[PDB]
Design a protein around this nucleic acid. Structure first.
Lengths: 125, 154, 113, 247, 85
RNA sequence: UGACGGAGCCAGCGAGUCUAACCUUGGCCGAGAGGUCUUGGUAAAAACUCCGUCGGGG
């Protein structure tokens, strides 16, 4: 079959399953494209790993994300994690890893939640 | 693609394509006299006969953005600056024109006086931003300077 | 330099004092017994403009609207847009109920006594 | 015969008896010898009244339950001016379940005097509209078509709503009365009203009702009572069943 | 009175004016402000306006009369193997 | 930080052959018990986004 790679994202009770395969440069979430994210103010939070990396690095990859659980804010944060993990897991497997290293550095210089999700764990004093 | 037409207490925005009523502005106590768009096209004036002028955003009757209280006389013409895009010039039946910066919508930046009777149309001049043409209702077409003290025509 | 033109203050329509500042599709809503959507029906039956104030719309046709109002049955207008001591006995007949129950029970006899 | 006399004493007492001061509907009930075999569904079959119209549809509160998208069902019937002054309020079935739930079905029963739904979602109704409506046949949900075109096998449903023809149905459904078929013999039809008309109007309403119900031809809407009617009993909703047509 | 410059026209600029006789008359400053064309409406006209120079579509003449009338006069405006064939 | 409708879509803990009203008007059948039908009265995901309509208490 075609090359593929699969990552996971996690906010409070919302999970994201993103599959990244070689293709025509199309971006899909739940069948719908990315220009139809319903919270409508957080739509720039899911374009956010797209525009930090430059749109040329998504021109030949495909992204298909399912999301279940959570609400609205927790769902959008799951999509931006799974896209950013899905891009950086494709590039560590079939593309240059120095490309992966510059892709990873461009995310952790911005924000750590795009790569791994900090579990907001309780603490007793 | 739009033009504003004034009426009894209702400035309605039309269309150039459909030539039909897009929106209506029905937030007026007395009759609205003038309605001039700015050169940016975002914000349109509405001079009201009750005394105070209201300027808000185009294509939005809901958000009354600004309501400057002029003198208690009715305001016949409220025009925006052509080269500048932040200063409103209004007239009144109080025989004075006022130049309001919309940052300070409570005190007039330059109370342009010296008119004889009933200034009802004024205009700007595209070369010089300091020069404001002002027309009264007895002849005597005033030409005013706002870089100067601005209380007597050149 | 003359122009030929064509307003008034508050008006009465069968003892209903209505202001002349808002348009008639919501001005008639202050009249008792009149619904909101009933006003949009009765205005278009009376051949007026819905976004138009009550200061205009002259009194010869203002009386024409209010006669549509007072006789709704004959102008083919449907009428479905339109509209104690029994608590005194029932508690007092349970007051003696709790009073005799305090008499019946040999414990409940110390309210304000 | 004595049907005029039976209606005379029923009309006289209903404005005089303190218990009967509130019931304004008149029912004839029919008990037959044999039991008609069709069990009680909840789709009311209506019958015509060929001479005297019962109600005109501009004096009844009419609730319509439509399909889930409900955009052009709402839009066309509100802005056609054939039905614009006819329908009281239009609700989609999913929004009716979500909004009106609990004790608010009681005020929906009291305020709105007649309920009608399309043939699409009428079977889904009794679990969202409540058991208060299905206590007899006062506000039993009636029937309307919506499109005046049929669906064959594997054909895509073409959506259409003609307001003139659905207005003519509500003209055809408020002008007369309806029967709901039952397993046992006793079925009741609401013929006439106390103050809409009078005794000779009710009398030929009785005659046209028993003519349609005993029609041996015209099977699927009319051939319900078989053999012969044993008796008929005129009543209000709280009165006694006064006897006529003994054999 | 309204004025438009450099719009797509056989002349460079046009100056229009409402006359309170139903007449809106156009003038051009290059031809010493002489009259070129005049439309006539029924009632007297209190407001006259034309579309600006950069409409890129149907241009409009909007004239407003005393009798509550807005007169609008408008100038309007296979297979992929066979392409590789 | 309103009202009125109309769309948009997001959850997790739940599932014992266990899940759940009362009063009344009658008709027919039955020796009764009651059964069947009739009738009327009484009680019983949100948020958010978006689209338009709207601008003192008895």
């Amino acid at each position: 079959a075609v090359p593929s790679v699969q990552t996971f994202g996690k906010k409070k009770s919302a999970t994201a399953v993103a599959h990244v395969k070689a293709g025509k440069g199309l971006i899909k979430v739940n069948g719908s494209p990315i220009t139809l994210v319903e919270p409508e103010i957080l739509r720039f939070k899911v374009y956010e790993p797209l525009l930090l990396v430059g749109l040329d690095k998504f021109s030949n990859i495909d992204i298909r994300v399912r999301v279940t659980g959570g609400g609205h804010v927790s769902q959008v944060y799951a999509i931006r994690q799974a896209i950013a993990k899905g891009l950086v897991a494709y590039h560590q497997k079939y593309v240059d890893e120095q490309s992966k290293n510059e892709l990873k550095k461009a995310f952790t210089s911005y924000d750590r939640t795009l790569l791994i999700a900090d579990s907001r764990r309780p603490e007793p004093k | 693609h739009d033009f504003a037409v004034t009426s009894s207490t209702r400035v309605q925005i039309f269309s150039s394509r459909t030539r039909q009523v897009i929106k209506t502005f029905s937030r007026f106590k007395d009759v609205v006299y003038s309605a001039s768009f700015r050169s940016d096209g975002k914000l349109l004036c509405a001079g009201d006969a009750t005394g105070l002028v209201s300027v808000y955003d185009s294509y939005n009757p809901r958000t009354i953005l600004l309501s400057i209280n002029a003198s208690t006389h009715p305001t016949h013409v409220t025009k925006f600056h052509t080269q500048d895009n932040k200063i409103l010039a209004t007239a009144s039946d109080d025989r004075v024109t006022r130049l309001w910066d919309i940052s300070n919508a409570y005190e007039p930046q330059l109370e342009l006086t010296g008119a004889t009777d009933y200034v009802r149309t004024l205009s700007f001049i595209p070369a010089a931003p300091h020069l404001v043409a002002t027309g009264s209702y007895d002849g005597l077409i005033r030409l005013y300077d706002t870089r100067s003290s601005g209380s007597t025509p050149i | 330099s003359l122009v030929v033109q064509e307003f008034q203050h508050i008006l009465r329509l069968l003892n209903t004092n209505v202001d002349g500042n808002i348009k008639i599709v919501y001005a008639l809503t202050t009249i008792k017994g009149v619904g909101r959507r009933y006003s949009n029906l009765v205005c278009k039956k009376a051949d007026v403009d819905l976004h138009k104030r009550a200061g205009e719309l002259t009194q010869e046709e203002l009386e024409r609207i209010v006669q549509i109002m007072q006789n709704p049955t004959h102008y083919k207008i449907p009428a479905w847009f339109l509209n104690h001591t029994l608590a005194n006995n029932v508690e007092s007949k349970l007051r003696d109920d709790l009073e005799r129950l305090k008499k019946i029970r040999x414990x409940x006899x110390x309210x304000x006594x | 015969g004595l049907a005029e006399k039976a209606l005379k004493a029923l009309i006289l007492q209903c404005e005089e008896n303190p218990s009967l001061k509130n019931d304004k509907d008149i029912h004839i009930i029919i008990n037959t010898g044999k039991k008609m075999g069709i069990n009680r569904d909840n789709i009311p079959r209506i019958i015509p009244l060929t001479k005297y119209k019962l109600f005109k549809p501009r004096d009844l509160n009419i609730l319509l339950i439509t399909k889930d998208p409900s955009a052009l069902y709402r839009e066309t019937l509100t802005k056609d001016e054939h039905t614009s002054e006819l329908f009281k309020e239009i609700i989609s079935v999913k929004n009716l379940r979500r909004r009106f739930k609990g004790s608010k079905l009681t005020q929906l029963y009291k305020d709105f005097d007649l309920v009608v739904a399309d043939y699409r979602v009428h079977h889904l109704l009794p679990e969202v509209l409540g058991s208060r409506f299905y206590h007899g046949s006062k506000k039993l949900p009636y029937m309307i078509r919506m499109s005046k075109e049929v669906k064959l096998k594997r054909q895509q449903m073409v959506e259409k709503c003609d307001p003139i023809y659905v207005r003519a149905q509500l003209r055809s459904i408020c002008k007369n009365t309806s029967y709901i078929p039952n397993n046992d013999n006793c079925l009741s039809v609401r013929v006439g009203y106390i103050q809409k008309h009078s005794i000779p109007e009710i009398l030929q309403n009785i005659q046209d009702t028993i003519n349609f119900l005993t029609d041996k031809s015209k099977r699927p809407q009319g051939g319900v009572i078989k053999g012969g009617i044993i008796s008929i009993f005129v009543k209000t909703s709280n009165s006694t069943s006064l006897p006529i047509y003994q054999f | 009175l309204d004025y438009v410059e450099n719009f797509d026209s056989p002349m460079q600029s046009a100056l229009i004016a409402s006359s309170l006789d139903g007449h809106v008359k156009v003038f051009d400053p290059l031809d010493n402000f002489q009259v070129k064309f005049g439309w006539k409406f029924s009632g007297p006209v209190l407001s006259c306006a034309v579309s600006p120079s950069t409409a890129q579509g149907n241009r409009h003449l909007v004239a407003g009369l005393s009798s509550g009338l807005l007169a609008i006069r408008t100038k309007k405006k296979k297979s992929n193997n066979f392409q590789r064939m």
